[PDB]
Amino acid sequence: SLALHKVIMVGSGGVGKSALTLQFMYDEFVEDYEPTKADSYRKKVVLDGEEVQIDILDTAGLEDYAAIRDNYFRSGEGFLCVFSITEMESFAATADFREQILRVKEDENVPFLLVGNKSDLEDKRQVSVEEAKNRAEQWNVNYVETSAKTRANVDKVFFDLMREIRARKMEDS
Amino acid sequence: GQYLVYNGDLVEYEADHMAQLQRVHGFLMNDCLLVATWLPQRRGMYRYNALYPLDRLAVVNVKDNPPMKDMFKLLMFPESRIFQAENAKIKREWLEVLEETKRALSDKR
Ligand SMILES: Nc1nc2c(ncn2[C@@H]2O[C@H](COP(=O)(O)OP(=O)(O)NP(=O)(O)O)[C@@H](O)[C@H]2O)c(=O)[nH]1
Ligand SMILES: [Mg+2]
Numbered sequence: 001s002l003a004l005h006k007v008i009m010v011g012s013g014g015v016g017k018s019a020l021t022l023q024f025m026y027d028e029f030v031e032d033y034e035p036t037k038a039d040s041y042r043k044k045v046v047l048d049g050e051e052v053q054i055d056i057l058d059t060a061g062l063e064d065y066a067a068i069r070d071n072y073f074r075s076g077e078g079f080l081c082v083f084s085i086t087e088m089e090s091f092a093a094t095a096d097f098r099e100q101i102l103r104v105k106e107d108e109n110v111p112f113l114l115v116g117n118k119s120d121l122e123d124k125r126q127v128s129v130e131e132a133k134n135r136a137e138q139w140n141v142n143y144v145e146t147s148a149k150t151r152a153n154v155d156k157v158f159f160d161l162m163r164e165i166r167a168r169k170m171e172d173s
Numbered sequence: 174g175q176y177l178v179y180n181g182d183l184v185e186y187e188a189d190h191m192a193q194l195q196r197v198h199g200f201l202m203n204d205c206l207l208v209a210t211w212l213p214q215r216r217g218m219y220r221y222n223a224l225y226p227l228d229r230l231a232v233v234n235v236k237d238n239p240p241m242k243d244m245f246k247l248l249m250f251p252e253s254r255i256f257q258a259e260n261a262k263i264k265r266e267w268l269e270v271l272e273e274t275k276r277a278l279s280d281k282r
Contacts, residue, residue, distance in 0.1 A: 004189055037272065038233040040246060057233065064279060071231040071248045 002044070003052040005165045007158065008073060010097045011082035012090040013061030016117040019148030020082065021058045024158050029149050036060050038072065047162055054162060073104045078111030078165040080157055085116045085145065086124040091132070098139065111164035112141050115157055120147040175203055179270045181263065183256040185210070191240045197256070201270055204278055206230065206247075208254075225249050227275045234268060 009017035018036050023029050025041050038059040045054055057076060063069040073079075081097055083090040094114065101110060114136045116127060129145070136143035142160065146153040179201040185194040200207040210221040231248035235241055235255060243264045244257045258264035 001190070038231060040233045040235045042236075042238050042241070065228050067229040068231045071229070071250060074250060075231075075248050075253055 003047075003050070003166070003169075005047075005052065005054050005162045006075065006077040007054060007056045007161055007165075008076035008079045009056065009058045009082060010073075010079050010101065011061055011115075012084075012087075012093045015061065015082045015084040015087070015090045016146075016148045017061065017080075017082050018058050020080070020115070020117060020146060020154060020157070021056050023148045023151055023154050025056070027151075045159075045162075047159065047166070052162070054158065056158075069100070070104050073101055077168075078113075078161045080113055080115050080161055082115045082117055083127070084118045085127045085132075086118050086121050088126040091116075091127045091135075094135070109168065111161055111168055112139075113157055113161050113164070114139065114141055114143045116143065116145040117148060119145040119152055120149045177201070178203060178274050179266070181258075181267070183258060183267075186244065186255040186257060188246065188253045188255045191255070199256070199267075201274060203274055204228070206271070208247075223252075227271075227278050230271075230275075232268065232271050232275075 009021060011017050014033065018034065019029055021041060025043055036058055041056045041058065043054055045052060057072060059072050079101055081094050083094050101112065102108060114132065116132050132143050144153050144157050146157055148154060177200060181199060183197055183199055185197050186192065187194055195210060195212055197208055197210040204227055206225045206227065208223045208225070212219040212221060225247060229249055233246040233248065235244040235246050243261055244255050245264060245268060246253065246255045258267060
């Protein structure tokens with residue numbers, strides 16, 4: 001039976017969680033903002049020779065109830081922690097998102113990638129590449145800048161996350 | 174005060190492999206969702222009833238994809254349950270009332 005890798009999009013409102021998901025799923029991108037509640041997507045892909053399925057849970061950057069947020073996080077196996085390079089506060093918000101994730105999952109090596117989205121808006125950069133890399137290195141995770149608009153590194157973040165999820169499964173069994 | 178906001182039949186599916194399970198009935202009240210299931214058994218027609226408080230219940234819109242149509246998902250530790258509505262209209266209504274009653278719960282606290 002085809003493996004199933006469960007990905008959870010995490011990050012402040014507006015960073016591009018939905019845009020990254022939709023670019024990856026359907027090769028589409030729209031400029032208009034569309035506040036998300038909670039949407040689940042599934043797609044068949046070939047991962048290193050194997051036909052597998054990726055499941056992506058895309059939710060709002062802000063959830064009123066902590067218990068609900070925990071239920072979202074708990075259903076996942078790997079996380080794309082997204083922040084926008086044009087907004088330093090979204091970058092600051094990643095620390096807590098990570099804390100909340102480590103707690104709910106109770107696992108320090110939880111598959112996780114720090115993602116700096118909106119790389120096409122370089123002229124508006126508020127977060128430097130070094131800052132982000134340094135934060136990622138201290139968290140012992142990789143950092144990748146993406147652009148849901150031009151597709152830059154979009155497949156890369158989802159596939160890299162799938163490989164980390166697959167790695168944990170290979171040992172934890 | 175308390176009242177019946179919405180109710181209806183749904184068909185449950187196992188979330189990971191999308192295998193069809195059984196019919197269930199959902200009853201939405203102002204602060205929780207009740208899901209009544211009836212699992213026939215040799216000589217013990219089993220029944221599983223679950224109550225999901227709206228301040229802890231994650232409701233997810235499962236996007237249409239062939240093995241899937243008109244479904245939504247409920248996530249509340251330790252469960253993940255998928256339900257199929259009879260059509261798109263019914264699904265829309267479930268998602269609308271679930272969201273509105275949760276919203277009302279908030280502006281109530
Ligand atoms: N130029 C540019 N715009 C982007 C990029 N990613 C997203 N956007 C834009 O930024 C806005 C917010 O994106 P969206 O994907 O909805 O963000 P989100 O993180 O899902 N928001 P929420 O948490 O509220 O659901 C949209 O107007 C979208 O077009 C990107 O890489 N480049
Ligand atoms: Mg969104």
